[PDB]
Write a protein that binds this ligand. Sequence first.
Ligand SMILES: CCCOCCN(C(=O)CCl)c1c(CC)cccc1CC
Length: 264
Amino acid sequence: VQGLTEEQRMMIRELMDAQMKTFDTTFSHFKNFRLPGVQVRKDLCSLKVSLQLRGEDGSVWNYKPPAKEIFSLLPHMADMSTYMFKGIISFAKVISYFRDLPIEDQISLLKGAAFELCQLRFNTVFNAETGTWECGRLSYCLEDFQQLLLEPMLKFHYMLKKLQLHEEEYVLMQAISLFSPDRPGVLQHRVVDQLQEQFAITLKSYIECNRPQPAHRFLFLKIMAMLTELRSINAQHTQRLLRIQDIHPFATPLMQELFGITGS
Ligand SMILES: CCCOCCN(C(=O)CCl)c1c(CC)cccc1CC
């Protein structure tokens, strides 16, 4: 199924192939991470998360948080973030359009979008019926209403999930986010921008060709608005993270590079 030009079909295929090669959807290789042991507030969410690890032998470990000092959870969160960031970096470097950019713009684009592409991937393993991100043998369950939807990042995941996007549309959202001409430090602003417009046109065109239903009217514009919201959620989270890092260091080396922390 198409309706697109051959160059548009190639673009989707190139993105789908990079996603296939760099997204471990069963989180098989996320191993030996840390776990909670046996203006700091006021800017953090009131959302609590419970953790579940299914054992290879069928046993289950379950973690419930106190019922809110979440410092015990940060090293684990830093390790999962780092694992997702590694996937995102591998995603970008397999795309020809990305490789073709100057090294400095690659770093600048990855610094801008790594959070955003990570969330887009986490949305594909989110279960909106049970409030759970299902990451292989690892589950993150939301702790007990619609008061949960007032945390903007949770609302993003629920709203994005309700759109019932195809694999192809998730991977085009990832490309539009990554090829953002107005990220800090971008030099080839015009090249990145024309790439972005092509990915966007392909998405608009894909939607027009393969989603005739009345429920998918304005779907392209809905997706664009969620990408705008994701970008704003990105700035909010970066600043929450740098505040905590200033009181309680937790960012991995890789997170430090992405957030421009230098070690001094
Ligand atoms: C430094 C922790 C940020 O976590 C808040 C953002 N988030 C989610 O909403 C789940 Cl998609 C998420 C979680 C919480 C389950 C764990 C690992 C990775 C991430 C994304 C990077």
